[PDB]
Amino acid sequence: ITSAAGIISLLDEDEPQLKEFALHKLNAVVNDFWAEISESVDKIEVLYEDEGFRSRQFAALVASKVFYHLGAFEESLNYALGAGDLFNVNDNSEYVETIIAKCIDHYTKQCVENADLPEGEKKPIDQRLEGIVNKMFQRCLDDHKYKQAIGIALETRRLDVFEKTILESNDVPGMLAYSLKLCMSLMQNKQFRNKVLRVLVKIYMNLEKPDFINVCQCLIFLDDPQAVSDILEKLVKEDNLLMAYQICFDLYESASQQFLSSVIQNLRTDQTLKMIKILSGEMAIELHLQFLIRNNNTDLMILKNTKDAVRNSVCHTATVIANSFMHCGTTSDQFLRDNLEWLARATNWAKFTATASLGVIHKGHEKEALQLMATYLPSAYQEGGGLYALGLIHANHGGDIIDYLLNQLKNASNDIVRHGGSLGLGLAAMGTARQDVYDLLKTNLYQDDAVTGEAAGLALGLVMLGSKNAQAIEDMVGYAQETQHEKILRGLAVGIALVMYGRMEEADALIESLCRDKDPILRRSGMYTVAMAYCGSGNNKAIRRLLHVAVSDVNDDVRRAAVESLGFILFRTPEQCPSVVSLLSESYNPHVRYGAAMALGICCAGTGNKEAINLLEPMTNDPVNYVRQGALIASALIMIQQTEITCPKVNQFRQLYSKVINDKHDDVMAKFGAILAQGILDAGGHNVTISLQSRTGHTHMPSVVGVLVFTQFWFWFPLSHFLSLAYTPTCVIGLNKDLKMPKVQYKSNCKPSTFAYPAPKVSTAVLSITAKAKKKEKEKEKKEEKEPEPNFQLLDNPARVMPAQLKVLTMPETCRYQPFKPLSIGGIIILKDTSEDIEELVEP
Amino acid sequence: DEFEEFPAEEDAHVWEDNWDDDNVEDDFSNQLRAELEKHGY
Amino acid sequence: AAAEHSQRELDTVTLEDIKEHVKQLEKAVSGKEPRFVLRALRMLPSTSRRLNHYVLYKAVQGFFTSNNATRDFLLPFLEEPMDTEADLQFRPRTGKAASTPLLPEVEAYLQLLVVIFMMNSKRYKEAQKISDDLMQKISTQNRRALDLVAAKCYYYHARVYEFLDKLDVVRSFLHARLRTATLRHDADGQATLLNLLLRNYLHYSLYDQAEKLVSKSVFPEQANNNEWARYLYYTGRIKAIQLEYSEARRTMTNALRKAPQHTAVGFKQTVHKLLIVVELLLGEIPDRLQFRQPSLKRSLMPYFLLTQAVRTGNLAKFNQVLDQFGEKFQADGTYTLIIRLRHNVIKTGVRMISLSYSRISLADIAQKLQLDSPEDAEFIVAKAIRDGVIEASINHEKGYVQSKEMIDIYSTREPQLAFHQRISFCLDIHNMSVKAMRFPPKS
Amino acid sequence: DLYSRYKKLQQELEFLEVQEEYIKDEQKNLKK
Amino acid sequence: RQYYLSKIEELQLIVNDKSQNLRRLQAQRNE
């Protein structure tokens, strides 16, 4: 029957043998009578506590089971761990399942702490506890699918098992791709991220034919320039070439200029000259330039109805900035050439935007530009504009242009020309960290000429981009709480913002020091520094730091830079973000509402989420003028390159943009969003898209910087063009050899139809005899009586495919020539050339 | 939710009845008759 | 027959009720709210009846029918109807839905209905095989919602074993099955299992074993009213036997207050049975409005003659009642408690004397309680004073039991403390109301 | 998918906590 | 594989109540 618990009387006795039969028996009946044995405890505990008992390792099991039944898990593992063999190894019963769950649950907590303090101070880990987990680790390895233990592997650090799991049978190296993706996306410790990456690279190298595409992509995050340099050299010496090219062509499309400048330098220490030529970015712009020029199609009609609808207000700058988008990187300045007298209807600063607008239009023009800029615009503003215009053409890639810009900035009127000059030089040597440029930029900043400062500050930040230069941050801020001329602070606010781009923990002091300064401009710079320093990784700590200021702080400008700054840090996961701001976007002060729209815009770079859009739908009717302005821009920013089929509101907004612009009694500010929105929708002739995220999951430093300084257009219209940086041609080049541009014919998967390139009184009753005449008149009338569609688009190497359709693209298997780098991710890819008789060269 | 687990295992007088009523004792007049007679004599 | 035609109409409506349950059951699984199931499970007792063999067959031929072995398990265990004229194919699962394995909620729900029908059909073993397999199915099933549907089946499974009249085979099973819930932070399943387990314990009189289980275990505070009422009775039964009388009344009266207004004529019958006997042993004459109530009128009439005995204190009358009605008490499981009273009738009269008199001389206490000697009362007078049935002090210098001089409480801190327990609950009610408020995710 | 579901869920919980904290603040600040 | 899935199935209940909670707090706010 077993309806009693007097056995505990046996354990009260003194015969060591008699205890064993009692202790054994309880463990055979503890699963039911956990009650009485709970009061025993000490009795069973002392048996294990005593080192002389013959079967102590059995005492703990029974005692551990009693505690597991009772529920004090904190003590259940302790005794479970003390025992061995029979303790839990059985790995069969529910009590085992609950104890093992904690034990592997307990293990991770220690290991996470240990990896924090590995300088000998690391707290010890019990071998039995490690024994059980690794036994489990040895269990999870040999049981079933390893794509699970890997997750538990990296869940509790333990890199050894991580390497063992993937290196083990692992079915296929496909689980390596699964692990890699998890390491990039769902890893929140950089120090671990580096350690995970080292494992992922090391597995890459030992492979028979190492995946060069992933390894270089893996390395970039790991920040290993020299390591990639040696890889490049061996690939060349092994006569790989073909695979070497994409590794270079994929490299320039993700890495930073400092990374490249270092990687290029290693190589210098024939083909390598080709390698240098393509890593520096000569080729990408040229092909990207050849694409946009060859595939350009901008509907000039949209501008015309906006140019004629302009009431001669300050929206003349809007149309001058609107077209810059509609022809960014297209060299098709027909509109400015065509409408010339009107272009001159804007004077003073707008002349500075126009002169700049020419630069963005010739985006990525390179060598011809230097003369090109002097030809059209050879006036303090105009000359200041041209020098700023010159920088846009050579943005991120100045090289030689920097030396000319340095010389030209020095010789200037110490006015607008200096303002444009610093912005141009800063943009040109963006991230170069060059000391020579930085020293000159400082002198202009120390000039303290107001308008000069607003550009020197940004130029100071951009040149020091991501450098963490202790001198720059101390120097930049030291000017902030020591200068009048709020304008100079406005540049410095963003200027010191970009100096901390992507460190993501490294300073975290400017983020806290700035957020406490009384000067509201510096606060905003502190909030932006959260955006530039935490771009991508949606650190829940920061997002809580930043939403706080947007709800409590008083100076409304900081509040906006609070809500807006969310997007930069949540942009890697556009799903969460349309929910976080969904309620911010109706806050009582219209400034916070504005931040919601820009937050929604930057947040959703190019996705037609239709969830962010619907939030902006009601906003576009908002009573405040600037809340409305941001709404359209935020809508237009997310809705770039998307046809009514892709998102069912794109065509709805377009007529709303037309209606707002063509209206006469809306404030100019709403119109400025309208005009700017028009340019966003058709930027680059429907051939570019804005996506801060890089093709391979990286954070695009040129693109992310572009939006942040663009959002600072509320304080300066001429900054507006900085969004040109965020336009990445959504293109796939079929480059097979170094220079060959074969007329590859490859196909897509537009299922039900094609999309992409879009667009090119009353009868009075008189009922007396109306019906009788009509009914008699009818009597007189009687008397009188895609399946083969595009998605097989025969497109040259410059074929425009939007990000959503980079996957539905069908490999050019039908064509004799097929790509060797996997042709499903847009960009520049190497066409795997088939047998001889190579032809179809394209070089217009 | 009848608790079928616990089995659900003349005097139709309306008035609510108090404990003291059940008490069995001789009528009041006989008490006073005794009490008055006892102290009366 | 039109009775069955309404029955199949009842079947279809029960199927529609089930389909409502299954659609709600399938609703909760994808609705992300286990609350939905509770509605279907409360209709369960209502839909528990009103079903014959055609009901389940068409239900199981309407539900499931994925060709799964499930059909092969309960279809044989229930009589199958003939080629009925009204073959309303009630398949909430159509093709792919049939192809998709039934969610652990609906399958148990349908299987429980078979289990219920098994009970309704007295087929506790086919249900046993059904049910343990149900458990053998739901034992592995680890969802969050199935714990609810599992909890209902458990008591029925405990109930199927309950009619099986073993209760030890499930003593262990319900004893271990409980531990599965607690290691899941599950709310309802832990509650339902414990009550069935305890009923198991009292049914064999292992009060010692039971008293432990409540000692270590913690009953989920956010528990079903129905369950909260049950656990309070079983704890009251345990506490009363353990001689913790004063707490027995507080829980039992609280257990009674939680009875489902007017559905459970029985539970109110038994609790009142203990409350009346429990109260007597503590020295309080129970409420008279009890013994006149309709449902408890004849049921408690056996206890009625007792409570009249205690107030009368006529021991000869008290023994006479135990001689006659005593035997019936055993079945109620109370005879033992009454036996305590027989040698405790003196306490109340000691309370009656302390409630009215304030300085009664001991010799007088002996006269008014029938105590043999003035000396004997002293131990009893002190003892009642000692045991906190009185609030008096016996000044032995001159043999008078002084009662405590009562104070103006409103000027002392008692009223504030009584208001605190009140306000804390009142504020908590606001938080509990506001805390849920179940604003549906704005559609 | 055993690990995959795990990180998305825990990330959601951590992020939903931030929404709670912000909303708790804004309710307080609005009351002001 | 069982513990790794039971753990996700309890954190799922907690997030579920949080989501129902966040909806309410959004409702208390917008009013």
Curated annotation (Swiss-Prot), chain A:
The PC repeats are at 353-380, 385-418, 420-454, 455-489, 491-524, 525-560, 561-593, 595-629, 630-670, 673-705
Cite the Gene3D superfamilies for this sequence.
Leucine-rich Repeat Variant
Q: Which InterPro entries match?
A: 26S_Psome_Rpn2, ARM-like, ARM-type_fold, Proteasome/cyclosome_rpt, PSMD1_RPN2_N, RPN2_C
From the UniProt record, give one GO term of the biological process aspect.
proteasome-mediated ubiquitin-dependent protein catabolic process
Q: Which residues carry this modification: N6-acetyllysine?
A: 664
Please report which protein family the annotation says this sequence is part of. Belongs to the proteasome subunit S1 family.
User: Does the record bear Iron in its keywords?
Assistant: no
Positions of region (Disordered): 773-798
Residues with Phosphothreonine modification: 764
The Basic and acidic residues compositionally biased stretches are 776-785
Quaternary structure and interacting proteins, as annotated = Component of the 19S proteasome regulatory particle complex. The 26S proteasome consists of a 20S core particle (CP) and two 19S regulatory subunits (RP). The regulatory particle is made of a lid composed of 9 subunits, a base containing 6 ATPases and few additional components including PSMD1. Interacts with ADRM1. Interacts with ZFAND1.
Q: What is this protein called?
A: 26S proteasome non-ATPase regulatory subunit 1
Annotated Gene Ontology cellular components are: azurophil granule lumen; cytosol; extracellular region; membrane; nucleoplasm; nucleus; proteasome accessory complex; proteasome complex
Q: Does the keyword Phosphoprotein apply?
A: yes
Gene Ontology terms for molecular function: enzyme regulator activity; ubiquitin protein ligase binding
Which residues are annotated as modified residue Phosphoserine in the UniProt record? Answer: 768
UniProtKB/Swiss-Prot annotation, chain B:
Its GO biological process terms? double-strand break repair via homologous recombination; mRNA export from nucleus; proteasome assembly; proteasome-mediated ubiquitin-dependent protein catabolic process
Q: Is the Transcription regulation keyword given for this protein?
A: no
Query: GO cellular component terms?
Result: cytosol; integrator complex; nucleoplasm; proteasome complex; proteasome regulatory particle, lid subcomplex; protein-containing complex
Q: Which UniProt keywords apply?
A: Nucleus, Proteasome
**Positions of disulphide bridges:** none
Where exactly are the transmembrane stretches of this chain?
A: none
Task: Provide the protein's localization.
Answer: Nucleus
Domain of life of the organism encoding this protein: Eukaryota
Similarity comment: Belongs to the DSS1/SEM1 family.
Subunit note: Component of the 19S proteasome regulatory particle complex. The 26S proteasome consists of a 20S core particle (CP) and two 19S regulatory subunits (RP). The regulatory particle is made of a lid composed of 9 subunits including SEM1, a base containing 6 ATPases and few additional components. Belongs to the TREX-2 complex (transcription and export complex 2), composed of at least ENY2, GANP, PCID2, SEM1, and either centrin CETN2 or CETN3. Component of the homologous recombination repair (HR) complex composed of ERCC5/XPG, BRCA2, PALB2, DSS1 and RAD51. Interacts with the C-terminal of BRCA2.
* Protein name stated in the entry: 26S proteasome complex subunit SEM1
Q: Which gene encodes it?
A: SEM1
From Swiss-Prot, chain D:
Task: Give the location in the cell.
Answer: Cytoplasm; Nucleus
Native species:
Homo sapiens (Human)
Shown portion of the complete protein runs from 39 to 70 of 418
> What is the annotated role of this protein in its UniProt record?
Component of the 26S proteasome, a multiprotein complex involved in the ATP-dependent degradation of ubiquitinated proteins. This complex plays a key role in the maintenance of protein homeostasis by removing misfolded or damaged proteins, which could impair cellular functions, and by removing proteins whose functions are no longer required. Therefore, the proteasome participates in numerous cellular processes, including cell cycle progression, apoptosis, or DNA damage repair.
- Protein origin, superkingdom: Eukaryota
Concerning its family, UniProt says: Belongs to the AAA ATPase family.
Instruction: Kindly indicate where the leader peptide sits in this chain.
Output: none
Put simply, this protein is called 26S proteasome regulatory subunit 6B
- TM ranges are none
On subunit structure and binding partners, the annotation says: Component of the 19S proteasome regulatory particle complex. The 26S proteasome consists of a 20S core particle (CP) and two 19S regulatory subunits (RP). The regulatory particle is made of a lid composed of 9 subunits, a base containing 6 ATPases including PSMC4 and few additional components. Interacts with NR1I3. Interacts with PAAF1. Interacts with TRIM5. Interacts with ZFAND1.
UniProtKB/Swiss-Prot annotation, chain E:
Q: Which domain of life is it from?
A: Eukaryota
Location relative to the cell = Cytoplasm; Nucleus
The entry sums up its family as follows:
Belongs to the AAA ATPase family.
Q: What is this protein's function per UniProt? A: Component of the 26S proteasome, a multiprotein complex involved in the ATP-dependent degradation of ubiquitinated proteins. This complex plays a key role in the maintenance of protein homeostasis by removing misfolded or damaged proteins, which could impair cellular functions, and by removing proteins whose functions are no longer required. Therefore, the proteasome participates in numerous cellular processes, including cell cycle progression, apoptosis, or DNA damage repair.
Q: Summarize subunit and interaction data from the UniProt record for this chain.
A: Component of the 19S proteasome regulatory particle complex. The 26S proteasome consists of a 20S core particle (CP) and two 19S regulatory subunits (RP). The regulatory particle is made of a lid composed of 9 subunits, a base containing 6 ATPases including PSMC5 and few additional components. Component of a complex with USP49 and RUVBL1. Interacts with PRPF19. Interacts with TRIM5. Interacts with NDC80. Interacts with PAAF1. Interacts, in vitro, with the thyroid hormone receptor (in a thyroid hormone T3-dependent manner) and with retinoid X receptor (RXR). Interacts with ERCC6.
Its name, as the record gives it, is: 26S proteasome regulatory subunit 8
Origin species, per record, is Homo sapiens
Provide the gene name from the record.
PSMC5
Q: Which residues of the full protein are shown?
A: 21 to 51 of 406
